[PDB]
Ligand binder design. Structure first.
Ligand code: HEM
Ligand code: HEM
Ligand code: HEM
Ligand code: HEM
Ligand code: E0J
Ligand code: E0J
Lengths: 141, 146, 141, 146
């Protein structure tokens, strides 16, 4: 459950990614694939070599979905139902994997937005990503 | 923990630049802020009411410094983390009863702090190496649980 | 996130608890304190001896809260705001403990309502308890 | 990891009443139903689209029997669960890469199935004795992660 403060912290912080969405999304995915090799088994058909264009494109998709999540922070289950069907109904992604990606997204944001990544903002971003994770791993339809 | 010699160099190089007076307090501080329930273990530490209070707290900074020191000793005995952390494990497991998941969280918060401090220098490859270190450190601290 | 079937299953099964609320709430508490002794540290001033009146009273408070949650399953954050202030802000309860109590509640339900505790109902009750747990461990004010 | 003499007697006494042909299937089936992502590890088992499909799936019931067999073998060697599940630990951790949290969940689902079957007979003290068993089994299975 996000507080009104968590909501404004996420919008201000994530709004900084701006046109770096694809770069940041790709980097978070790269960090996850390298640090937690097991997460690769979910993308067996992907070219997972560093600099891979497939990963670059996918990173953009992930970043954009987050941007949409931030925009519909008050009705995420509704706004993310399509992704919930994909990750929970079809892919059956183990919840631990979302925690690994969320951690890598935080690391990416901390590496690129040092001024934005305050303790409180870091706290709101974590809760936000945890919420997004819960929705994508839940079958509520 | 298995670190390629190339990963060892990258790790050591980065760690050698770590501000030992601040990094530790910042990781412990962010832990108390991001996962509030951990605060319940540091009731003697005084004011933890707000984030700024937590981060600027002298006792938190001093304690974080010890935590940082613990990670430094682990980096100097990767081939023997269980033995090195045998005493700390008994303390955190048999006495404090800290849930193992919390050891993992602090390890990752430390990773976030390194990212915050080194920005561009904390590359994905460097992170990967550090993730193996913190996992090894967390596992050792939790061995008295196993 | 609960699906319509989940909400339907939860209401129907909890409705079956009825007058036994306090009885089951107290038992779930006893099972937790005995199975996971650490959890007792949250009640330093409680009389946690078997059959204590204080535990009975608390089990009733816990049970009635769940009845309330069940009735406001679509508006839980608002309905349980005061319980959130208590558990998340004041007591700072580690979320691991909510999983322990939730499991002990499920055990208690399976031990008293064998006909009701079907796999589907079990699944729904678990999600609901996890959902209640997230709300109580979250600071959203 | 630590069962008192009285807790062993309690566990041993109850398990003798357990139907080895059903309980395993009920537990594995409920694991797949209650925590749907676990269905991913059982791709070849067939229809797991709905609760009834899962609970009625022959391969699930049969595999549950094998799982239950392992729990029994562990109950006959409570003083050495690490060795009892040594080979299984390699399979689940090194080969299958099952996250250890899932081992804990299966353990608790088994406990729920035990409660469901024995009812009032599954008393708080018996449950506590059993929580130590499943925790020990989960711990043993994750040994290759430690
Ligand atoms: C904040 C968390 C996450 C978000 C927002 C997210 C977002 C997305 C998006 C937008 C897509 C594209 C769907 C489409 O329009 O076709 C997708 C696909 C996918 N995601 Fe995620 N994802 C997240 C976490 C995960 C995790 C943790 C895993 C597993 C390690 C994962 C595995 C996949 C896979 C396998 C695909 C399919 C790729 C393909 O073949 O096209 N995702 N995700
Ligand atoms: C996994 C990383 C961790 C490391 C490397 C670590 C390291 C340390 C060290 C070096 C000490 C000082 C011991 C002494 O002076 O004798 C200590 C004490 C302590 N740690 Fe940790 N720790 C870790 C995780 C945790 C976590 C997650 C908690 C719980 C939220 C925790 C709670 C404490 C407490 C309560 C003390 C006692 C301080 C006092 O009151 O004097 N530690 N830790
Ligand atoms: C199903 C989840 C839970 C529910 C619905 C619940 C509900 C409640 C209720 C209704 C009260 C009474 C509040 C009042 O007096 O106004 C309470 C108090 C309390 N709860 Fe919870 N609770 C839950 C889980 C937990 C857990 C997991 C812990 C700790 C292991 C915990 C620790 C406490 C404590 C320490 C109190 C205050 C006791 C006192 O009077 O000193 N609760 N809870
Ligand atoms: C915690 C208790 C558990 C026990 C004692 C257990 C035991 C077993 C046993 C006895 C086998 C048969 C080994 C063989 O003869 O090859 C097996 C196989 C397997 N287990 Fe487990 N297991 C446990 C938990 C889990 C969990 C949580 C998962 C994953 C969600 C899992 C996934 C598997 C898979 C995929 C196989 C191989 C199935 C196949 O033949 O395709 N197990 N397990
Ligand atoms: C609010 C929250 C916090 C966490 O962190 C523990 C995890 C999940 C959530 O909420 C997910 C959710 C469910 C239903 C509607 C909106 N958001
Ligand atoms: C639906 C759900 C599921 C889990 O894990 C099984 C954890 C949390 C939630 O949702 C909690 C929530 C948050 C905000 C509004 C309503 N419910």
């Amino acid at each position: 459950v996000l507080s009104p403060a968590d909501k404004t912290n996420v919008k201000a912080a994530w709004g900084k990614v701006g046109a770096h969405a694809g770069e940041y999304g790709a980097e978070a995915l790269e960090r996850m694939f390298l640090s937690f090799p097991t997460t690769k088994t979910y993308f067996p058909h992907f070219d997972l070599s560093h600099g891979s264009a497939q990963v670059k494109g996918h990173g953009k998709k992930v970043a954009d979905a987050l941007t949409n999540a931030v925009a519909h922070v008050d009705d995420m289950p509704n706004a993310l139902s399509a992704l919930s069907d994909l990750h929970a109904h079809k892919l059956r992604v183990d919840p631990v994997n979302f925690k690994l990606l969320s951690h890598c997204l935080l690391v990416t944001l901390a590496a690129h937005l040092p001024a934005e990544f305050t303790p409180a903002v870091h706290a709101s971003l974590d809760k936000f990503l945890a919420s997004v994770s819960t929705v994508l791993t839940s079958k509520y339809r | 923990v298995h670190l390629t010699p190339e990963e060892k160099s990258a790790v050591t190089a980065l760690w050698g630049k770590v501000n030992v007076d601040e990094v530790g307090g910042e990781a412990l501080g962010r832990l108390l802020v991001v996962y509030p329930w951990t605060q319940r273990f540091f009731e003697s530490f005084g004011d933890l009411s707000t984030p700024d209070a937590v981060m600027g707290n002298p006792k938190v900074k001093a304690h974080g410094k010890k935590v940082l020191g613990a990670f430094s000793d682990g980096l100097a005995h990767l081939d023997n983390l269980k033995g090195t952390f045998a005493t700390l494990s008994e303390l955190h497991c048999d006495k404090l009863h800290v849930d193992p998941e919390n050891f993992r969280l602090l390890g990752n918060v430390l990773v976030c702090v390194l990212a915050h401090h080194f920005g561009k220098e904390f590359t994905p490859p460097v992170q990967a190496a550090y993730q193996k270190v913190v996992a090894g450190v967390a596992n050792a601290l939790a061995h008295k649980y196993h």
